[PDB]
Symmetry: D2
């Protein structure tokens, strides 16, 4: 069921915004986000290695936790999530509907606080941490599914791929495929918040772009495939998410707004025949309380 | 964009519930429900007839309104919805995100109250009412998309198709295709609330199964393709929706719970090799406030 | 296996011939032709009615024989095919590969001799005749699969659908759907050989356009959906089939050249933004010794 | 057109042969073989490097010539193919249909003569040689399309992948993906003729298994992904190809019988629930005079 439903998502051209921008719509996944792919890969790996006797505990900003909970619900794994109290309340409710357990961690501690608590619960319960920031299967999910899909959906002609970095899974897996095919003929652009520009060589900080900018450089981030880093302001991301819904009818989340805002800045630096691709990580109904 | 994204949704087998039941997952549509199909068909028809000079006004229990708003947002139509105040608050928020206008009508007046207000606004603004309860394009959407999809996805072997009646579009369009192919070899079962059993020959009444049981028999309901009517209690529908999320990882709405609860009663009356198909009209995140 | 592989074929636009024409590629079917669809439907229907206990006998000089032989091979039905002995060594070989029993009837004579022999085999062995020219399930296969596919693949915008009539199944089933959706907004154009223009009111004659022009009006032909008839000369058909290979890289059969030759004549009488769709029934490699 | 049609081919399970075997049907490609993928990738790469101004010349006796001719026809590249004059009238015809220029070199001699003639044509005309045995884009086509497809189509569960080596492109690219995902959990099995077992450490010889066993080790063969080599006799291959047609209704070529014959040998050494996947490179109707 899950193996079959996850991936093979559609791409749309954003004609009412900039007709050079194509948005891959990951909300079509059964868990409602891109994170279904890495969750599936990391889980199948841990099962075959015999690591899930006591279930799974994973820190999350929301989406990876929802994906793990969904797959765990179907496959019969106990799932515990830790997540900062600052993530949208919709996340908490979804996790509960999926019968997962949740421990909220302090907002000012961000993703590091969630990781810390997850490490504790893992030791206390014996639940296995998939560790999205270090697990190479996160990258393999995008290397073997997302990247191949994007490559063919764009008819093997792409000038730039633009993606927010959360775990770094998406840009790394997709970037490996695209650099493999295009070499220097394609630009791979990482997106991060202006408020937390760690990839640009700056300081971590509080920001509102849920799902990106963890405040540190993930171990799985494959820097050799990344050409540049662009920053996006919080209000830029929200504005674009809202614009996508009103002008394209696309019910996409905050990080999709950030991706598209950044893709627009990329496309403007290039010619009229530029082909720019980005991802819409999730849907707008996960953000009704704040978007 | 919309023409391309709408439809071609997947089917899953509910092994952790009853392995004779296959659920078509309509939440994969870009508007997050089955209603994307009839909305697209009715809109394309009204455009080609030159009826949308002043936009669209339609009454809704939520999903048809969201679909119309989404397509209107992309195609450039002004969209006004009327909807009972008793429908989930998520509906109202989505309509606003899509830049549609909304007039809430009294809860005790139900769908009839919404229709009445929509007729008023139509006259006042000149906006065109697509009229989901009378428009044959509602039925054609399921006759030309949903039904053909279901027929092939089930490898041309179906013992029963089970669906809630809202507008009656789905059961009518799908039932025409399936009766066309199977004749009396397939049973077509209409689902309604026990609290409002109009199709069984009873009285209209207040119920909690959002999206079904409008309290009257729609004009587009094709009674010649319907074999029986089954009733479902409110708590049955909610319980099943919850069970689908916890045991299958399927984030489906209330009417999906009602469909599956009814499909289970159908399958139990049949043999161990029975093939029963139903629809999951929408997703669970449209119901976080109440489910 | 066959239920899964048959149908859902791609469409392409004929940019090197006329960019207003779109070509549905039925050679992508496992039997290499459009006839996989009606054969499947006729066989599933006959199975369901318990009519296949002593196998299948069918008189056929064309793709229906391959489709039947192929489905019969997988499903475990005995398949006897009657064919005038004038049929190519290419076709005999394929039928024999699929384990059909070939009954060759006296030649110049023709298809009548094959029909007569099939009727006696049916009496002598109990084998069931599907009768492709009379069986409504031929039409339903197109009403329930091909037409729905085309409608959506053309994003619900079609000014004309153009198709050769062999059995009349394709034009009738697709025509029903397209008339249903578009009404008089779509023109349905039947194609036939200039040498055998029976649908135009003329006399049957010998022609070389494989797959079309039986020299009678088939029982299953839905005349109510057909707006006009257009004729194609044998050499128009062969020349266009060759051109499709040469300039589009499309290895299509003789009937495909006929369809596209006709569609070209249709398109030229319409505006610059007209949308014309037609079918490529089979593949070139079935005709290497004559094309 | 070609970017859209190539790849995304179906898999079937060989229930009438051994239900542990799954067969990827590459005949569904517009060129009727697996070689559409590497041809597309090699040509797109060469175009991008501006290497195709005077066209393409390639020495090829098999499906690569068809793929190149077909892509060349649509894209507007001059295609010259060199082939020993010992090649069938069937293949010459198809190549000529696609508008390739056929350069026939002295026979018994063989493929070396064709390579030598291509090298001089390249010098004399400026035409660019893709060199399918050395070009890494042959491997990438499978790494980026075929392997990703197989991984998902098998629901991420594969005990063995079995494939004939022609160029070694298919086994290398798929093998990279499957090794990447499964590690030592998957066995990658290369197939070659008993008459020409060079990968097994033996001597090159003449054989009748079309599409495999070039009688050298191709430069692009990723030996690091191959776990074992298995041999197949010419008559094993032809017999299995015939059986696939007869009992599965699958019109597959000679190399497909070889692959399935090998996969059968593999499956028999494994448990009852083993999952073995293999490829059907091309179709039967390309071999009517010998199969
Ligand atoms: Zn596009
Ligand atoms: Zn199933
Ligand atoms: Zn098109
Ligand atoms: Zn399978």
């Amino acid at each position: 069921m899950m193996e079959r439903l996850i991936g093979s998502t559609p791409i749309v051209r954003l004609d009412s915004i900039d007709s050079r921008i194509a948005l891959k719509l990951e909300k079509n996944n059964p868990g409602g986000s891109v994170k279904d792919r890495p969750a599936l890969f990391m889980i199948l790996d841990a099962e075959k290695r015999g690591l899930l006797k006591n279930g799974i505990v994973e820190p999350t900003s929301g989406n990876m936790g929802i994906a793990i909970a969904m797959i765990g619900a179907k496959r019969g794994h106990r799932v515990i999530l830790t997540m900062p109290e600052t993530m949208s309340v919709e996340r908490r409710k979804v996790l509960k509907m999926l019968g997962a357990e949740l421990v909220l961690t302090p907002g000012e501690l961000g993703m590091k606080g969630a990781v810390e608590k997850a490490l504790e619960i893992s030791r206390e319960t014996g639940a296995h941490m998939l560790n999205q920031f270090e697990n190479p299967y996160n990258v393999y999910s995008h290397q073997f599914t997302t990247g191949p899909e994007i490559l063919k959906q764009m008819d093997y002609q792409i000038d730039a791929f633009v993606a927010g970095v959360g775990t770094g899974g998406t840009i790394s897996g997709v970037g490996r495929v695209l650099k493999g095919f295009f070499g220097n003929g394609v630009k791979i652009v990482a997106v991060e918040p202006a408020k937390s520009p760690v990839l640009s060589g700056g300081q971590p900080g509080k920001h509102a772009i849920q799902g990106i900018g963890a405040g540190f450089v993930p171990k799985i981030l494959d820097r050799s495939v990344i050409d540049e880093v662009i920053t996006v302001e919080d209000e830029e991301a929200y504005e674009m998410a809202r614009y996508l819904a009103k002008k394209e009818g696309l019910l996409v989340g905050i990080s999709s707004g950030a991706n598209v805002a950044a893709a627009l800045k990329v496309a403007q630096k290039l010619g009229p025949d530029a082909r720019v691709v980005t991802v819409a990580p999730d849907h707008a109904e996960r953000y009704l309380s704040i978007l």
